Design a protein around this ligand. Structure first.
Ligand code: S9F
Ligand code: MG
Ligand code: ZN
Lengths: 897, 862, 159
DNA sequence: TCAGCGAGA
RNA sequence: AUCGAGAGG
DNA sequence: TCTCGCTGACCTCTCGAT
């Protein structure tokens, strides 16, 4: 009778609304509340504002027979990562709303918006103990994705710190010598000295000795009144240079990181509380305000607009000149308008920075302007450069109805009025921005696949004893070192003894965790490349070990046994896409190589042809360009296109004519196969190049030192150009194309395929400004490489070529070698995260994930048995997970009696 | 017919052949989609009912009869009535109206949906349908769309948009002939306007109508390009032609990004009417149209002189020219008073006219909710200071002065309807009498002798409104919990054949007597004029009056068509006033929004040199991160308007001659670079000028049409006229210390709205309660008093933490372990808390469901 | 610049620059026009209940020479007005009174004239009425039926 | 809807 | 309970 | 090698009708 089809028996087991995903993986719970969240600036990190109306009900059985002795868990709706649930000690407040600490707002993505959070009460004693020891906001100083602190001053606090620590020329009280920070505070409160007055103060600072003791150093330092006042809350053991500068968001983040590294946990939380209090107080005292006059419209825009309009008019030469094809015209118009947009943004920023000309004691000096928009910009509290240039420059280009960009520019900012046509154009960008958070968030929510493919991994032993590792090198693609060698190696063990430049001297012995001091020692040496112990080349079966993993990023020190590294890695990788797609509407819907230092031209992997003129024209498709200075080779990596011809300009080409983000990340994680790649199979050294009558040119590659040759078929149409590429390495490029991860694995190796996947994912993540540690991607790749085909098993029980767990094959080979048997040979198989998750031994996990009917049919016909050893199985059957606190219980269960 | 016309036009015109010929040789375009309104859908449902009736008639008449076949027995009205009843009440397009404010009703009535029967599906729809199209210009608002999955699919009609005979949206354009714009208007559809080139509204024109600029910006073929005067064929009729009604209410819309304009247009619809409607100081000029067309305000049907004024009713004495020959000459306008809304808000009409005041046709006589003198008033003008204040406006939060709470500027009345239904039961277990078993003396005395509560009584939680006992456990209707209020209305419903108890007869007859007295008074008010005219057919008039009174009494006493199985229904209306507190969502018209975090004492708020504190403190960091500069511009313009109003009020406080007030108000109205409005005070009389100045003493309202609003120079001039700084920023002093803030702070009056997102409606906390049947899990709603869902992502978070015992207790002890729950509650209450988790009942449900599929799944012991 | 008495009490200061040549139309004109087309008498069978009746009114047996017809229709006065419909919790509807007609012809004699014609007026269900504000009252709740954006009937060629 | 996936032709 | 229509995050 | 089904695409609240 109803229009919708009837729900059958299988419909109640499979799907999002099925039994698994709606009642076993996620349940509704008692002792839970919810209300709107408001800001409490008086709260400490371990505190939150819990209304008495809730506390009367949530603690009702406790009341029958309490707030301070029993913590509560606060929870925001998305919960993109672990810090979306934290434990606080509640203080009873009047009203209905919940008071949330301002610092944990970034960790929760919380906002005083109408936003709501849930409350949960740990009932059992063990639940309270684990809440206090693990989920407390004080224990969550550092982010799990990367070692950066997750609690950070923002908005009002950043503006207050930036107002205090900034200086002004000829401010009241300039040039006076002060006996300490207290005198500076006294002159500020008395009104005798300004907060930006450049004074000379006597500062006593402490620095840790060799044994760790604190020794004081007293000296007179050129500073300001605000910095001197701020120095009073800085704990003992930090240099004065941290506050002797205009503090932005990055400066405060670095200061908090330094405090955590030098002092520890409790000093860091105390320092964060003091910084928040001081920032709020001095942002209130500053009286910062935004006005229509604060946005200054430069006179350069009125000419740059005309220049760009004339440029595009000349570029489209009345459609009679030719080459007005839609591909070329659109690209050149977009390039011209982007050039105009960046020129106007630079012009307005330059007008705003030195808008203030200040009269000194008889001098008309120029200093950085105290404009409100500018002070909100460089402080980094809130407000990107794109938004500011939209306000005071132009809007620029907008998102097309399609994925492309509008041809027509807005050519107007928001301080000035917009035409109805321009506003109609910007409505397209508005629709795209809201549609990204409305629909594209499903693509991010990748996260579930990553969680399920990797949820089985738990750190199980201290160390393998292995020696394998991966090369770590800096990234200099963009003309600067985007990822220094310290960022890659920090907090990870060393597989091989790092040797000092030269020989017989080792800076870092192997099997030592490279913490901040070891990284500084490595940076003392001019150059260093370290082979780092990794998780993909981990000898542990059924898990990973602490040494091959590295350091617990959230806790700083080395990771302990029992930590679910797979879930943490999956959450860390999955969050940035989800968070960035949501923040798309914040924006509003909006040819040569030049080296830093001149020198002689060097090249790497380059094949070129001599042009008719003296210039050199590149012929190879993949060519890299690196310059050498008068002192050494310049540290950049650049890509030279096929048609390119060669502060010195060393390359020239036309990007227009040749003579995705999360989709790309998913393609890498699903082990997609590109159509083009064709690379050498086995190292031979001789290519026969025999003549074959068949249309597809046939390649026979025969070894110099081996009798058995290899023959391959190379279609001429599919692969137009074929090189020699002999015996350099099995996997050498024979035809031009994007390399396939499966072939790259099979030919080069596990380490090489891991490096390829990690680099290709991190390029996409870095393009958007996201910073995630590489060990998470390495964990995910390790989950990708779990199946092997046992070719030529011999004495093993495997029959012909069948997919088998790599751990089982390795254990069988070890047992056979103990008994003297030859063992089974195998080839590692690369499986996408979906297929690898569906191919797990347990059928309950596969049924819960996806393909429920098919998985159940396979398990039923095959008579499979599930041992319930992973996290998801024990969650479903409602027992303790084999991780964290329950890891000891699960190990006791495995050891049995 | 429209389909045949489209088929002929597409092929430039055997029918199947022509389609194949052109196939061998954009759907989102408006020319491919037409509008289907309520009338056509009702006609289609009538067609469905009528074809069902026709099938029934054919089946009945297939037998054939000589003289025994008649129209009556052949047809039956049941299928048609069933079909129409299903359409009006169960159709997807038949929606519960949004009744938060007049603007919400206007937007709902002007709403256009691409979904519905014979339409698209939100999950199947792609990006092409959801995106703006060049044909949306002037027909569908590009700004106002839902923020959820319904984006792009649910759309709002533009201000000037119509529908032609064929159902295609069309827009008005000014015909341009020989280079001069002509006042004649031609409505053009998308396919019709595609051929023509259309000039823009922002095109300067001379006195004769010629375009000022040599080259005029235009559009053609879906693209905008510069054009000369000769080629121009049409011009936009207004600058509001593109935006909808809701989006046109935003002042300075061209200074906002379309995202924040969308947010403001949506949040204008959740604004709750307050105790006093306060006009927007800065507006657009569309408030009057919205208020009049919404129908919430009583509008004089005929022009006349007011004869009687009252809170509940207004009487108009119609003019001699406007009376019908048979008409007595009296128009009575009864006013809605404290009635519940669809969204549980209050509907109130208050007269805005005085006795003896002349009235013409179309004048507003009473002000509906969120209306002030015929102008839509969705919020209150508030003095805002854009500056951080100790982190109490930290992250988009809002700090509110205690004077706002004291003056009840944002206090709202919310009416809650509770119903008590008595059903028929064998052996008479259920009772409805006042006497109930095990009832407190105070609770019994609270209810009347009829068992119902008295009108006007104050009721708190756990108090019975209507007395009832059933077996006999008390089935009395009572307020659920927490909710408190006063009984403003009680309605008792009984069927014609339903037995009426004497006490229930007493209550129902009291209500009916009140209604009959009201009706008799209303009839006698009109009959008095006719009787007086007869004094200057008395028996006939008396007989007609008696007949009308008897008919009204019969209509009042007519039994209601109660549902089968129930005897009487008693409805109790509770009205309570909600005062703002920390946790209430506040927002403006430019996309800005926030939650009150603290109620700050009046002395602690920042104050000016004159000692006047600010009402609202807003973080300035939320302005440049977003792209809502319109809020800053509106703040400056509101400051200037309040300065003008303050000057007028100052001249009113000390007695000033009417000449000075006339001169100042004329100067204020004449200010502006070039304004079409020409207010001439020389035409007005002295009393009219005094009344205007009295209305302007709280601030002169300002109208800024979208894409045609006030320039910055005009705002600066208005600030100058009010003796205020042109920068819009003033020196503020800290209330707690008296120390001047180191930088000037912009201060002005911004129109703030209170949204229907109160914290008391949202605050919830459950310890334990009812559990579902199929799965022994807590319920899933605040109304059902259920727990919060602990989704899979939260389980992932606990797994990442390694919190094994917390996750185990949340999976089993807090849900699905019936024995575990039962033992845990005793353990927690006793104070020695220990849990023994077991198998969740959901796992057993899964096992049973899998076994019912034919697959044997078991629990292997070892 | 204020002529109405309501606007004369308080004139809003207008900063607009562009002259207004076409006044804002009635905001709810679409609902009123649609329901007026649906309800009002149509001399031709193009729109409304008239067009609806001309579709399936001629219900008769196959080749029986006895068909059912009608002459016109009329909508009666509603029993209750909007306010007491909302109070009572009942639909605000108007009874539909339709005058039907039936014709009887000679059996197996098509050439012969019609034996008799029977016309009579019959009540046919309740049709809900829309108030002056463009809304409907259904079961005591005030409802709005929004317009639908659907593809125009005809032929289109898309890939 | 829109993809991607292997397995029949 | 389910479905439809909305809304907030 | 290429069609061809089969698979996939967080939390909360309000209302009424079945
Ligand atoms: N899973 C999921 N699907 C969704 O569709 N949406 C989600 N979550 N949110 C949550 O709410 C935050 C943004 O909401 P908003 O209104 O506060 O926007 P905003 O930019 O952060 O601040 P503002 O409104 O002041 O401009 C966002 O992170 C997320 O947690 C909102 C929509
Ligand atoms: Mg928010
Ligand atoms: Zn290891």
């Amino acid at each position: 009778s109803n229009k919708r089809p009837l729900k059958s028996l299988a419909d109640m087991i499979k799907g999002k609304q099925g039994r698994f995903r709606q009642n076993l993986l996620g349940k509704r719970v008692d002792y839970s509340g919810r209300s709107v969240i408001t800001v409490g600036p008086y709260l400490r990190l371990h505190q939150c504002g819990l209304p008495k109306k809730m506390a009367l009900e949530l603690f009702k059985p406790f009341i029958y027979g309490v707030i301070r002795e029993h913590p509560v868990l606060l929870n925001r709706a998305p919960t993109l990562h672990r810090l979306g649930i934290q434990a606080f000690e509640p203080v009873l407040i009047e009203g209905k709303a919940i008071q949330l600490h301002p610092l944990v707002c970034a960790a929760y993505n919380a906002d005083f918006d109408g936003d709501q959070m849930a409350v949960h009460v740990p009932l059992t004693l063990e639940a309270q103990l684990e809440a206090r020891a693990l989920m407390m906001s004080t224990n969550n100083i550092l982010s799990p994705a990367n070692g950066e602190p997750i609690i950070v001053p923002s908005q009002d606090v950043v503006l207050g710190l930036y107002y205090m620590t900034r200086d002004c020329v000829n401010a009241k009280g300039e040039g006076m010598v002060l006996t300490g920070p207290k005198e500076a505070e006294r002159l500020y409160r008395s009104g005798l000295a300004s907060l930006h007055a450049r004074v000379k103060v006597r500062i006593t600072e402490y620095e840790k000795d060799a044994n760790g003791e604190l020794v004081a150093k007293t000296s007179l330092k050129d500073t300001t009144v605000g910095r001197a006042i701020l120095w009073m809350i800085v704990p003992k053991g930090l240099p004065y240079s941290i506050v002797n500068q205009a503090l932005g968001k990055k400066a405060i983040s670095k200061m908090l990181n330094t405090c955590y590294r030098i002092l520890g946990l409790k000093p860091t939380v105390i320092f964060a509380d003091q910084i928040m209090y001081t920032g709020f107080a001095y942002a209130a005292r500053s009286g910062a305000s935004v006005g229509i006059d604060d946005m200054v419209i430069p006179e350069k825009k009125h000419e740059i607009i005309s220049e760009a309009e004339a440029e595009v008019a000349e570029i489209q030469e009345q459609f009679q000149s030719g080459l007005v094809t839609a591909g070329e015209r659109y690209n050149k118009v977009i390039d011209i308008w982007a050039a105009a947009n960046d020129r106007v943004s630079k012009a307005m920023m330059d007008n705003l920075q030195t808008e203030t000309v200040i009269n000194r004691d008889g001098q008309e000096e120029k200093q950085v302007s105290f404009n409100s928009i500018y002070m909100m910009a460089d402080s980094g509290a809130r407000g990107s450069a794109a938004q500011i240039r939209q306000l005071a420059g132009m809007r620029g280009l907008m998102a097309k109805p399609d994925g492309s960009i509008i041809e027509t520019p807005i050519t107007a900012n928001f301080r000035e009025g917009l035409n109805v046509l321009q506003y109609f154009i910007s409505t397209h960008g508005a629709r795209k921005g809201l549609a990204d958070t409305a629909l594209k968030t499903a693509n991010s929510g990748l996260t579930r696949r990553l969680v399920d493919v990797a949820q089985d991994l738990v750190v199980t032993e201290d160390d393998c004893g292995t020696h394998e590792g991966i090369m770590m090198t800096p990234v200099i693609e963009g003309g600067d070192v985007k990822e220094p060698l310290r960022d890659r190696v920090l907090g990870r063990v060393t597989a091989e003894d790092v040797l000092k430049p030269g020989t017989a001297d080792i800076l870092v012995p192997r099997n030592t965790l490279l913490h901040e001091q070891w990284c500084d020692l490595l940076e003392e040496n001019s150059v260093d490349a370290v082979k780092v112990r990794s998780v993909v080349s981990c000898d542990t079966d059924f898990g990973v070990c602490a040494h091959c993993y590295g350091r617990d990023l959230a806790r700083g020190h080395i990771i302990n046994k029992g930590e679910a590294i797979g879930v943490i890695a999956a959450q860390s990788i999955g969050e940035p896409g989800t968070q960035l797609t949501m923040r798309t509407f914040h924006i509003g819907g909006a040819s040569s190589i030049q080296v830093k230092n001149k020198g002689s031209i060097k090249l790497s992997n380059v094949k070129s042809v001599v042009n008719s003129s003296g210039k050199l024209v590149i012929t190879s498709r993949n060519t890299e360009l690196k310059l050498i200075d008068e002192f050494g080779r310049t540290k950049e990596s650049y890509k030279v296109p096929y048609g390119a011809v060669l502060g010195e300009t060393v390359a020239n080409w036309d990007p227009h004519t040749m003579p995705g983000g999360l989709p790309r990340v998913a393609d890498l994680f699903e082990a997609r196969r590109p159509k083009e790649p064709a690379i050498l199979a086995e190292i031979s050294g001789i290519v026969s190049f025999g003549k074959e009558t068949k249309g597809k040119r046939r390649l026979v590659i025969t070894p110099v030192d081996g009798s058995d040759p290899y023959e391959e078929m190379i279609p001429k149409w599919r692969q137009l150009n074929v090189f020699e590429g002999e015996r350099v390495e099995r996997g050498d490029v024979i035809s031009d194309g994007p390399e396939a991860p499966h072939d790259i694995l099979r030919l080069r190796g596990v380490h090489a395929v891991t490096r390829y996947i990690v680099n290709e994912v991190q390029d996409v993540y870095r393009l958007q400004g996201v910073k995630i540690n590489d060990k998470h991607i390495e964990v995910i790749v390790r989950q990708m490489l779990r199946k092997a085909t046992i070719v030529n098993a011999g004495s093993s029980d495997f029959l012909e070529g069948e997919q088998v767990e790599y751990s089982r094959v390795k254990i069988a080979n070890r047992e056979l070698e103990a008994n003297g048997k030859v063992g089974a040979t195998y080839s590692r198989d690369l499986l996408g995260i979906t297929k690898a998750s569906l191919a797990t031994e347990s059928f309950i996990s596969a049924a819960s994930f996806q393909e429920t009917t098919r998985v159940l049919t396979e398990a039923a016909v095959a008579g499979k048995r599930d041992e319930l050893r992973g996290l998801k199985e024990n969650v479903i059957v409602g027992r303790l997970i084999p991780a964290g606190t329950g890891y000891a219980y699960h190990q006791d269960r495995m050891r049995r009696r | 017919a429209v389909g045949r016309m489209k088929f002929n036009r597409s092929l430039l015109r055997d029918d199947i052949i022509d389609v194949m010929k052109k196939l061998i040789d954009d759907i989102d375009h408006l020319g491919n989609r037409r509008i289907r309104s309520v009338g056509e859908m009702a006609e289609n449902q009538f067609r469905v009912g009528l074809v069902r009736v026709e099938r029934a008639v054919k089946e009945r008449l297939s037998l054939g009869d000589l003289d025994t076949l008649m129209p009556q027995d052949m047809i039956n009205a049941k299928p048609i009535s069933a079909a129409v009843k299903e359409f009006f009440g169960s159709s997807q397009l038949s929606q519960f109206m949004d009744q938060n404010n007049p603007l919400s009703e206007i937007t709902h009535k002007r709403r256009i949906s691409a979904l519905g029967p014979g339409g698209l599906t939100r999950e199947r729809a792609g990006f092409e349908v959801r995106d703006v199209h060049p044909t949306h210009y002037g027909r569908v608002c590009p700004i106002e769309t839902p923020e959820g999955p319904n984006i792009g699919l649910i759309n709002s009609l533009s201000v000037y948009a119509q529908t032609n005979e064929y159902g295609f949206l069309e827009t008005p354009y000014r015909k341009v002939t020989d280079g001069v714009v002509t006042d004649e208007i031609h409505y053009l559809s998308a396919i019709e306007e595609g051929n023509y080139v259309i000039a823009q509204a922002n095109s300067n024109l001379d006195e004769e109508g010629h375009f000022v600029e040599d080259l005029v910006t235009c559009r053609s073929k879906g693209e905008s390009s510069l054009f000369s005067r000769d080629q121009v064929d049409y011009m936009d009729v207004s600058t509001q032609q593109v935006v909808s009604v809701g989006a046109s209410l935003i002042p300075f819309l061209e200074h906002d990004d379309a995202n924040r304009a969308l947010m403001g247009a949506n949040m204008q619809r959740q604004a709750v009417p307050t105790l006093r409607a306060d006009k927007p100081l800065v507006g657009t000029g569309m408030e009057r149209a919205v208020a009049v067309d919404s129908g919430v305000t009583a509008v004089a049907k005929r022009g006349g002189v007011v004869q009687y004024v009252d809170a509940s009713r207004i009487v108009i004495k119609v003019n001699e020219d406007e009376m019908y020959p048979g008409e007595a000459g009296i128009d009575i306008y009864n006013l809605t008073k404290y009635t519940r809304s669809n969204q549980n808000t209050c509907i109130n009409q208050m007269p805005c006219v005085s006795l003896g005041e002349p009235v013409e046709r179309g004048d507003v006589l009473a002000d509906g909710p969120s209306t002030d003198l015929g102008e839509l008033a969705l919020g209150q003008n508030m003095r805002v200071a854009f500056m951080p204040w100790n982190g109490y406006n930290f992250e988009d939060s809002i700090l509110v002065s205690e004077r706002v709470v004291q003056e009840d500027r944002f206090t709202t009345i919310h009416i809650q309807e509770l119903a008590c239904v008595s059903r028929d039961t064998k052996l008479g277990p259920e009772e409805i009498t006042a006497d109930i078993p095990n009832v407190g003396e105070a609770a019994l005395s609270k209810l009347d002798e009829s068992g119902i509560v008295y009108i006007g009584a104050e009721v708190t939680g756990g108090d019975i409104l209507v007395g009832k006992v059933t077996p006999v456990k008390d089935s009395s209707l009572r307020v659920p919990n927490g909710v408190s209020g006063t009984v403003i209305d009680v309605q008792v419903f009984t069927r014609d054949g339903v037995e009426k108890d004497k006490r229930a007869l007493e209550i129902e007859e009291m209500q009916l007597k009140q209604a009959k007295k009201d009706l008799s008074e209303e009839l006698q008010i009109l009959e008095a004029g006719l009787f007086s005219r007869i004094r200057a057919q008395y028996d006939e008039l008396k007989h007609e009056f008696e007949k009308k009174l008897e008919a009204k009494r019969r209509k009042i006493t007519q039994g209601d068509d109660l549902a089968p199985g129930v005897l009487k229904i008693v409805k109790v209306y509770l009205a309570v006033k909600r005062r703002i507190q920390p946790g209430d969502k506040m927002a403006g018209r430019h996309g800005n929004k926030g939650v009150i975090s603290k109620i700050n004492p009046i002395e602690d708020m920042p104050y000016d040199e004159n000692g006047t504190p600010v009402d609202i403190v807003l973080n300035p960091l939320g302005v440049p991160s977003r792209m809502n500069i319109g809020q800053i511009l509106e703040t400056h313009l509101g400051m200037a308007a309040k300065g003008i109003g303050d000057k007028i009020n100052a001249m009113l406080k000390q007695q000033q001659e009417v000449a000075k007030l006339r001169e100042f108000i004329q100067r204020a109205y004449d200010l502006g670079a070039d304004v079409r409005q020409k207010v001439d005070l020389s035409t007005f009389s002295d009393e009219e000028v005094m009344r205007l100045a009295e209305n302007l003493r709280k601030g002169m309202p300002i109208a800024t049409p979208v894409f045609d609003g006030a320039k910055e120079a005009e705002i600066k001039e208005l600030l100058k006229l009010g003796d205020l700084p042109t920068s819009g920023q003033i020196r503020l002093y800290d209330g707690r210390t008296g120390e001047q803030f180191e930088r000037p702070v912009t201060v002005g009056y911004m129109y703030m709205l209170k949204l229907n997102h109160l914290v008391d409606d949202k605050m919830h906390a459950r310890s334990t309660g009812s559990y579902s049947l199929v799965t022994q899990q807590p319920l899933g709603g605040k109304a059902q008093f259920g727990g919060q869902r602990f989704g899979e992502m939260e389980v992932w978070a606990l797994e990442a933490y390694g919190a094994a015992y917390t996750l185990q207790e949340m999976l089993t002890v807090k849900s699905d372990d019936v024995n575990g729950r039962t033992k845990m509650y005793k353990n927690i209450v006793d104070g020695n808390h220990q849990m023994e988790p077991g198998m969740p009942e959901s796992f057993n449900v899964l096992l049973k469901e899998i076994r019912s599929l034919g697959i044997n799944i078991e629990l292997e012991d070892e | 610049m204020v002529y109405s008495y309501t606007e004369k009490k308080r004139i809003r200061k207008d900063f607009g620059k562009r002259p207004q040549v076409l006044d804002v139309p009635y905001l709810l004109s679409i609902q009123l026009d649609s329901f007026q087309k649906f309800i009002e008498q149509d001399p031709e069978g193009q729109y409304g209940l008239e067009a609806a009746f001309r579709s399936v009114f001629p219900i008769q047996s196959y080749s029986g020479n006895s068909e059912l017809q009608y002459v016109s229709y009329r909508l009666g006065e509603p029993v209750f007005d909007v306010q007491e419909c909302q109070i009572r919790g009942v639909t605000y509807s108007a009874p539909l009174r339709v005058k039907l007609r039936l014709v009887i012809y000679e059996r197996e004699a098509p050439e012969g004239t019609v034996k008799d014609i029977k016309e009579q007026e019959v009540y046919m269900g309740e049709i809900p009425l829309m108030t002056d504000n463009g809304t409907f009252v259904i079961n005591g709740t005030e409802r709005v039926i929004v317009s639908q954006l659907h593809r125009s009937p005809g032929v289109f060629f898309d890939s």
